[PDB]
Amino acid sequence: ATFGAWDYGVFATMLLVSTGIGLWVGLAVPVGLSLAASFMSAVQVLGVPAEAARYGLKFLWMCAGQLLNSLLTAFLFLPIFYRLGLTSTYQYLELRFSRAVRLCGTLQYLVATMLYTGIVIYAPALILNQVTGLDIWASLLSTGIICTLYTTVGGTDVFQVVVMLVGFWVILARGVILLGGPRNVLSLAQQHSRINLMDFDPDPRSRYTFWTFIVGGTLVWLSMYGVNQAQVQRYVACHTEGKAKLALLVNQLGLFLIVASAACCGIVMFVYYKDCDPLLTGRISAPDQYMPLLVLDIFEDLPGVPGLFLACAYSGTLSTASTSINAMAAVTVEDLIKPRMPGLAPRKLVFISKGLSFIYGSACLTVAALSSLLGGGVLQGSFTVMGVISGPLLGAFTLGMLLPACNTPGVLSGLAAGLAVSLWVAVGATLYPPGEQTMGVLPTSAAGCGRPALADTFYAISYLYYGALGTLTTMLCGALISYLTGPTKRSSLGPGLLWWD
Ligand SMILES: [I-]
Ligand code: NA
Numbered sequence: 001a002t003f004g005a006w007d008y009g010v011f012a013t014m015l016l017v018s019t020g021i022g023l024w025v026g027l028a029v030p031v032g033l034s035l036a037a038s039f040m041s042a043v044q045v046l047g048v049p050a051e052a053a054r055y056g057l058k059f060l061w062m063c064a065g066q067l068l069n070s071l072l073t074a075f076l077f078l079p080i081f082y083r084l085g086l087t088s089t090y091q092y093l094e095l096r097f098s099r100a101v102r103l104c105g106t107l108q109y110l111v112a113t114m115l116y117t118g119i120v121i122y123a124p125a126l127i128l129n130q131v132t133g134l135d136i137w138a139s140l141l142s143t144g145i146i147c148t149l150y151t152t153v154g155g156t157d158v159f160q161v162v163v164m165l166v167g168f169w170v171i172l173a174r175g176v177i178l179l180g181g182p183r184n185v186l187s188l189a190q191q192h193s194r195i196n197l198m199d200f201d202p203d204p205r206s207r208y209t210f211w212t213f214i215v216g217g218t219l220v221w222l223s224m225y226g227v228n229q230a231q232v233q234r235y236v237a238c239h240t241e242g243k244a245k246l247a248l249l250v251n252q253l254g255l256f257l258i259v260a261s262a263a264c265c266g267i268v269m270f271v272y273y274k275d276c277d278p279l280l281t282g283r284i285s286a287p288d289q290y291m292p293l294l295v296l297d298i299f300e301d302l303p304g305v306p307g308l309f310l311a312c313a314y315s316g317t318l319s320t321a322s323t324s325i326n327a328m329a330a331v332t333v334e335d336l337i338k339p340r341m342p343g344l345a346p347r348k349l350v351f352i353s354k355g356l357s358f359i360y361g362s363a364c365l366t367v368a369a370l371s372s373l374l375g376g377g378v379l380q381g382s383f384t385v386m387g388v389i390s391g392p393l394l395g396a397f398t399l400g401m402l403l404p405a406c407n408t409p410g411v412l413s414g415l416a417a418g419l420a421v422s423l424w425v426a427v428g429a430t431l432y433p434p435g436e437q438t439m440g441v442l443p444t445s446a447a448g449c450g451r452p453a454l455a456d457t458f459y460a461i462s463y464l465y466y467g468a469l470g471t472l473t474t475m476l477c478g479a480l481i482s483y484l485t486g487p488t489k490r491s492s493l494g495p496g497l498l499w500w501d
């Protein structure tokens with residue numbers, strides 16, 4: 001399970017070329033594909049195939065969970081932000097409830113993005129460690145060095161999406177060629193119940209079901225695209241509000257393609273490891289090393305393909321991390337400092353921007369190391385952190401956008417309660433992980449070569465519900481206390497803020 005001779009050279013050369021091009025640069029369909037490219041880091045490459053291989057093909061419902069998300073963002077959140085010409089999405093909060101809510105929302109965005117970028121830095125480290133033969137910590141150090149060179153020197157997404165999706169297609173083609181024909185692969189996956197699209201298991205403990213996707217995944221993708229900062233800023237830069245919607249729908253098509261290719265590569269990966277499954281044989285340690293192992297195993301006759309594909313999947317996600325870190329620094333120095341501080345020359349402010357970029361780089365690397373220590377689940381971990389933090393923020397946004405009677409006390413108390421409950425599940429589900437069989441992990445073979453009351457019912461809910469469980473309560477708490485301290489008469493909101501218009 002190591003690169004080899006022709007693969008190390010290709011990996012090194014491609015990484016050097018990627019860094020050189022990125023720095024040399026530093027010193028409406030394109031945007032649609034850039035939006036998806038953002039969240040197509042190594043996290044998805046390592047998670048979606050593994051989840052599809054383990055839990056079956058129900059993971060395709062994720063696409064639906066994104067589709068229903070985009071529609072909402074297309075027809076419920078895009079008009080409000082776009083028609084108001086908001087410089088920052090969280091400026092809405094300031095115009096709606098108060099500047100304190102703007103501050104809290106910006107802080108939640110910063111923390112959530114920091115954790116998510118830490119996990120996005122962890123995943124490439126996982127790739128490098130699993131494929132080269134370096135301990136997780138030396139690989140994490142190398143990943144941090146490269147990410148900081150990208151960020152603290154100088155900040156194409158269409159190219160990344162195209163190249164990595166073509167890599168997915170090539171992996172799938174080679175795999176299905178090896179296993180015979182596509183009909184044989186489909187029948188083999190069908191024998192072991194890997195083709196189970198129709199899974200309406202009502203219970204919420206099941207990790208992946210129709211309800212779980214349509215609700216939790218929809219709300220999480222909403223709090224990752226609908227009310228995010230970078231995505232909304234990309235929207236508002238377009239024209240006439242039609243180009244924005246077309247960019248959003250093209251982004252949705254790109255996401256559909258990426259996640260469907262990944263969910264099919266997962267099934268190919270399983271059918272490949274039908275017997276002598278690497279996981280319960282000691283060949284790999286966690287169910288996130290599946291994809292690099294598949295890449296190495298299938299292309300054990302092509303001297304170069306592993307290096308090219310993994311170098312791309314590494315450099316593109318490091319670029320994503322640098323972009324997220326720089327956006328974090330920019331929003332901090334635009335929405336929190338400059339409004340607060342009277343006014344400072346263009347030198348001190350760029351120096352503060354560099355300082356915040358560096359600080360966020362270090363904090364994200366530290367979060368990556370913490371994720372490495374705790375365990376795995378780059379996909380699960382990223383969704384967990386993002387949902388857990390940004391869910392109540394999305395609840396605040398939705399309460400402001402669709403409920404007239406809502407004031408600052410309501411939103412703030414709702415955020416407090418939502419973060420409380422969301423972290424309750426986020427931790428109580430980490431101290432007492434749910435059983436592998438309650439999560440519905442499909443069977444496998446390897447012969448071819450509840451202590452507390454709530455750990456069994458409430459901490460076991462699907463990891464896609466956490467954010468939802470936050471958002472909903474934020475709406476229900478904020479709706480309640482707001483109506484207690486006093487309703488907010490609708491004749492106080494001026495321009496279009498409520499969507500009831
Ligand atoms: I995904
Ligand atoms: Na990602």
Ligand code: NA
Nearest residue numbers: 043379382383
């Ligand atoms: Na994700």
